[PDB]
Paper text:
The four antibodies with 6 cysteines ([name]-1, [name]-2, [name]-3, [name]-4) used three different cysteine pairing patterns; [name]-1 and [name]-2 used, while [name]-3 used and [name]-4 used pairing patterns. The knob of antibody [name]-1 has 2 additional anti-parallel β-strands, extending from the second and the third of the three antiparallel segments. In contrast, in the knobs of antibodies [name]-4 and [name]-3, a two-turn α-helix and a long loop extend from the first and the second of the three antiparallel segments. These four knobs could be described as two-layered structures with the three antiparallel segments as the first layer, and the additional structural elements packed against the first layer as the second layer. In the crystal structures of antibodies [name]-6 and [name]-1, there are 4 and 8 copies of Fab molecules in one asymmetric unit, respectively. However, electron density associated with 4 or 3 knob regions of antibodies [name]-1 or [name]-6 is mostly or totally absent, suggesting that these ultralong [name] are highly flexible. To examine the extent of this flexibility, we superimposed the heavy chain variable domains of each Fab molecule in the asymmetric unit for antibodies [name]-1 or [name]-4 in one asymmetric unit. The stalk orientations of stalks of Fab copies within an asymmetric unit for antibodies [name]-1 or [name]-4 significantly differ from the rest of heavy chain variable domains, which superimpose on one another. The twisting angles between the two strands of stalks are also different among copies of the Fabs within one asymmetric unit, suggesting that the CDRH3 stalks could undergo tilting and twisting motions due to their inherent flexibility. The superimposition of knobs on these Fabs within an individual asymmetric unit indicates that there are only small structural variations in knobs, suggesting that the knobs are structurally stable.
Numbering used by the authors:
A (entry chain B): 2 to 113, 119 to 217
B (entry chain A): 27 to 136, 174 to 193, 198 to 210, 217 to 266, 274 to 294
């Protein structure tokens, strides 16, 4: 089946935190736990194998330990680099069968711009148009996308992506307004008002004054 | 060095067999064991199976019926077969090297068994999603510079985006797609400063080149 983990944990920057992984006397009880770090966009990297041994290129800040039926990965001196999903694992009943943990979501607490695009001229030839508003490098990842047309707010055809972890421990997203070339020239101005911790960064394009 | 190249179809249809191939460059298949691990979109890593050097096979008991794994030393490749797939088997599949060892455990004076397995090296993961070709549109700003390259309406995931045949590696931010109500994805790949962005889609096997100017 699967191993127990808190699924969600939080700690502060530079401090110490611990992720528990607990199971039975047939899996964790035998005691050959492994630990893995999965950052979005990257491949899972192996961290600790056999309870306490660190793997290739793994600094000793990531320390594996075990107490009976509950293994524990402990991260010393937290960094933004460390936000990821950590999975434990041990073998059960055979050397050829593994079980994994639910995996917890590491959050580093103490850490403290959008370009707007008009539709391509080629796209309007099929009488279709797509407003692309690409937001990047904001933290944390909670943004409120509101499209504005001549002071009024747009509700139809709003398509926004959830926040996604970038390489720089920063969250980026995309939001798409799928319109037609007819009502794209109807309004006089279009605005992409994204809000991030109370601040509103606004990018604006006007159909006539852009060609 | 040592890498594991996963190769196979990024789309399959229900009640048919998904097959994948892992190409091993940097080590021998009669030296290391190979294991398969998949992650479902929103789930944990799921064990699938492993084949050691001596050709012996071992799978996740729940999926032993539907699974089968073989390899060819000459091609330095390992294969995987998941039969009678359903809409939940769509997942990212990782090719890995595993170290297996059955440690024995007798009393403190001198049977017993304590089993060890862990992943050594991880593949990159190709996401089989269980066809639609994309449409490419260049993007430029209204009146540093910012240039765009909008990929429009494609299924299934994923698409790989480069700029000028991998020669432009600077200032590029490829974005996560959106799941439109139509079920067609749309992602963009911005670049910030003769700029052609190359878009590929493994399912439809399409490769287009669209230059972008302001």
């Amino acid at each position: 089946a699967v191993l127990n983990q808190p699924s969600s944990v939080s700690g502060s920057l530079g401090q110490r935190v611990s992720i528990t992984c607990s199971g039975s006397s047939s899996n964790v009880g035998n005691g050959y736990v492994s630990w893995y770090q999965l950052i979005p966009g990257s491949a899972p990297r192996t961290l600790i194998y056999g309870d306490t041994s660190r793997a290739s290129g793994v600094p000793d800040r990531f320390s594996g330990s075990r107490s009976g039926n509950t293994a524990t990965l402990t991260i010393s001196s937290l960094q933004a680099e460390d936000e990821a999903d950590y999975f434990c694992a041990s073998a059960e009943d055979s050397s050829s069968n593994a079980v994994f943990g639910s995996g917890t979501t590491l959050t580093v607490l103490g850490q403290p711009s959008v370009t707007l695009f008009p539709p391509s001229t080629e796209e309007l030839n099929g009488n279709k148009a797509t407003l692309v508003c690409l937001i990047s490098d904001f933290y944390p990842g909670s943004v409120t996308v509101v499209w504005k047309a001549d002071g009024s707010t747009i509700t139809r055809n709003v398509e926004t992506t959830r926040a996604s972890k970038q390489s720089n421990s920063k969250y980026a997203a995309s939001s798409y307004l799928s319109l037609t070339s007819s009502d794209w020239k109807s309004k006089g101005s279009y605005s992409c008002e994204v809000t991030h911790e109370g601040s509103t960064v606004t990018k604006t394009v006007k159909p006539s004054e852009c060609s | 060095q040592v890498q594991l190249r996963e190769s196979g179809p990024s789309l399959v249809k229900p009640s048919q067999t998904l097959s994948l191939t892992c190409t091993a460059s940097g080590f021998s298949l009669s030296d290391k064991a190979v294991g398969w691990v998949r992650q479902a979109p929103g789930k944990a890593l799921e064990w699938l199976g492993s084949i050691d050097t001596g050709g012996s096979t071992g799978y996740n008991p729940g999926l032993k019926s539907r699974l089968s794994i073989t390899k060819d030393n000459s091609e330095s490749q390992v294969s995987l077969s998941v039969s009678s797939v359903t809409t939940e088997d769509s997942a990212t599949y990782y090719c890995t090297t595993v170290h297996q060892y059955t440690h024995k455990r007798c009393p403190d004076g001198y049977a017993g068994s304590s089993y060890e397995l862990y992943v050594d090296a991880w593949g990159q993961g190709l996401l089989v999603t269980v066809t639609t070709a994309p449409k490419v549109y260049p993007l430029s700003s209204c009146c540093t510079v910012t240039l765009g390259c909008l990929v429009s309406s494609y299924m299934p995931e994923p698409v790989t985006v480069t700029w000028n045949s991998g020669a432009l590696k600077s200032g590029v931010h490829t974005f996560p797609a959106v799941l439109q109500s139509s079920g067609l994805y749309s992602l963009s790949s911005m670049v910030t400063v003769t700029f052609t962005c190359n878009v590929a889609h493994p399912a439809s096997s399409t490769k287009v080149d669209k230059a972008v100017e302001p």
